[PDB]
Amino acid sequence: SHMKQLEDKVEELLSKNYHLENEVARLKYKRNQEEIETYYEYTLKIEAINNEMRKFRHDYVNILTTLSEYIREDDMPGLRDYFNKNIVPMKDNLQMNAIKLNGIENLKVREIKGLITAKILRAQEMNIPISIEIPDEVSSINLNMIDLSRSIGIILDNAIEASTEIDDPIIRVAFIESENSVTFIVMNKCADDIPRIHELFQEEGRGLGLSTLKEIADNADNVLLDTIIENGFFIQKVEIINN
Amino acid sequence: GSHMKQLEDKVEELLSKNYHLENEVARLKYKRNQEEIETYYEYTLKIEAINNEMRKFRHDYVNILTTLSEYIREDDMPGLRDYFNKNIVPMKDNLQMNAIKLNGIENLKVREIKGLITAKILRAQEMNIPISIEIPDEVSSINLNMIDLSRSIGIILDNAIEASTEIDDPIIRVAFIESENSVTFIVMNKCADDGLSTLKEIADNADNVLLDTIIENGFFIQKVEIINN
Name the experiment that determined this structure.
Answer: X-ray
Strand partners, A186: A173, A236
In angstroms, the CA A182 to CA A240 distance is 5
H or E element at residue A224? strand A223-230
Q: Could you say which DSSP state residue A107 is in?
A: B
Q: Could you say which DSSP state residue A151 is in?
A: H
Please list, in sequence order, all residues whose beta carbon lies within 8 angstroms of the beta carbon of residue B56, skipping any fewer than 6 positions away: B118, B121, B122
CB A235 within 8 A of CB A227: yes
In Å, how far from its chain's centre is CA A13?
Answer: 49
C-alpha distances (whole Å) from A198 to each of A192, A194, A202, A207 are 17, 12, 8, 15
Closest by Cβ to B47, choosing from A13, A46, A68: A46
Q: What distance in Å separates residue B219's CA from the closest CA in chain A?
A: 30
Q: Does B122 touch chain A (CB under 8 A)?
A: no
In angstroms, what is the resolution? Answer: 1.9
Say whether A221 sits in a helix, a strand or coil.
Answer: coil
H or E element at residue A238? strand A233-241
Q: What distance in Å separates residue A72's CA from the closest CA in chain B?
A: 8
Look up the CATH number of domain A93-243.
3.30.565.10
- Strands B209-215 and B172-178, bridge-based pairing: unpaired
In angstroms, the CA B175 to CA B185 distance is 6
- Mark yes or no for CB contact B18/A20 under 8 Å: yes
- List the one residue out of B154, B171, B146, B167 whose CA is nearest residue B119: B154
In angstroms, the CA B112 to CA B117 distance is 9
CB B204 within 8 A of CB B197: no
Superfamily of domain B35-227: Histidine kinase-like ATPase, C-terminal domain (3.30.565.10)
Say whether A62 sits in a helix, a strand or coil.
Answer: helix
**Hey, where are the domains in chain A?**
1-86, 93-243
Q: Does A3 touch chain B (CB under 8 A)?
A: yes
Question: Nearest residue of A to residue B4 by CA position?
Answer: A3
Partners of A16 on chain B (C-beta within 8 Å) are: 14, 18
In angstroms, the CA B113 to CA A242 distance is 34
In angstroms, the CA B203 to CA B209 distance is 5
| 3-state DSSP of chain B | CHHHHHHHHHHHHHHHHHHHHHHHHHHHHHCCCHHHHHHHHHHHHHHHHHHHHHHHHHHHHHHHHHHHHHHHHCCCHHHHHHHHHHHHHHHHHCCHHHHHCCCCHHHECCHHHHHHHHHHHHHHHHCCCCEEEECCCCECCCCCCHHHHHHHHHHHHHHHHHHCCCCCCCCEEEEEEECCCEEEEEEEEECCCCCCHHHHHHHHCCCCEEEEEEECCCEEEEEEEEECC
In angstroms, the CA A120 to CA A138 distance is 18
Here the contacts of A213-217 (C-beta below 8 Å, separation 24 or greater) are A213/A150, A213/A151, A213/A154, A213/A155, A216/A147, A216/A150, A216/A151, A217/A151
In angstroms, the CA A89 to CA A105 distance is 26
Q: What distance in Å separates residue B6's CA from the closest CA in chain A?
A: 10
- Mark yes or no for CB contact B15/A20 under 8 Å: no
Please list, in sequence order, all residues whose beta carbon lies within 8 angstroms of the beta carbon of residue A196, skipping any fewer than 6 positions away: none
Partners of A46 on chain B (C-beta within 8 Å) are: 43, 46-47, 50
Please list, in sequence order, all residues whose beta carbon lies within 8 angstroms of the beta carbon of residue A170, skipping any fewer than 6 positions away: A128, A129, A130, A131, A163, A187, A188, A189
Residue B177: Cβ-neighbour burial (10 angstroms; 0-12, 13-18, 19+): middle
C-alpha distances (whole Å) from B8 to each of B1, B29, B82, B114 are 11, 32, 93, 63
Phi, psi of A142 (to 5 degrees): -90, 55
Residue type, A106: N
In Å, how far from its chain's centre is CA B39?
Answer: 17
Strand partners, A234: A188, A229
| 3-state DSSP of A108-143 | CCHHHHHHHHHHHHHHHHCCCCEEEECCCCECCCCC
Strand partners, A176: A183
Question: Nearest residue of B to residue A115 by CA position?
Answer: B47
In angstroms, the CA B178 to CA A25 distance is 44
In angstroms, the CA B206 to CA A103 distance is 38
The end-to-end CA distance of chain A, in Å, is 55
Q: What distance in Å separates residue B49's CA from the closest CA in chain A?
A: 9
The end-to-end CA distance of chain B, in Å, is 56
CB A121 within 8 A of CB A53: yes
Within 10 A of A236 (CB to CB), how many other CB atoms are there?
22
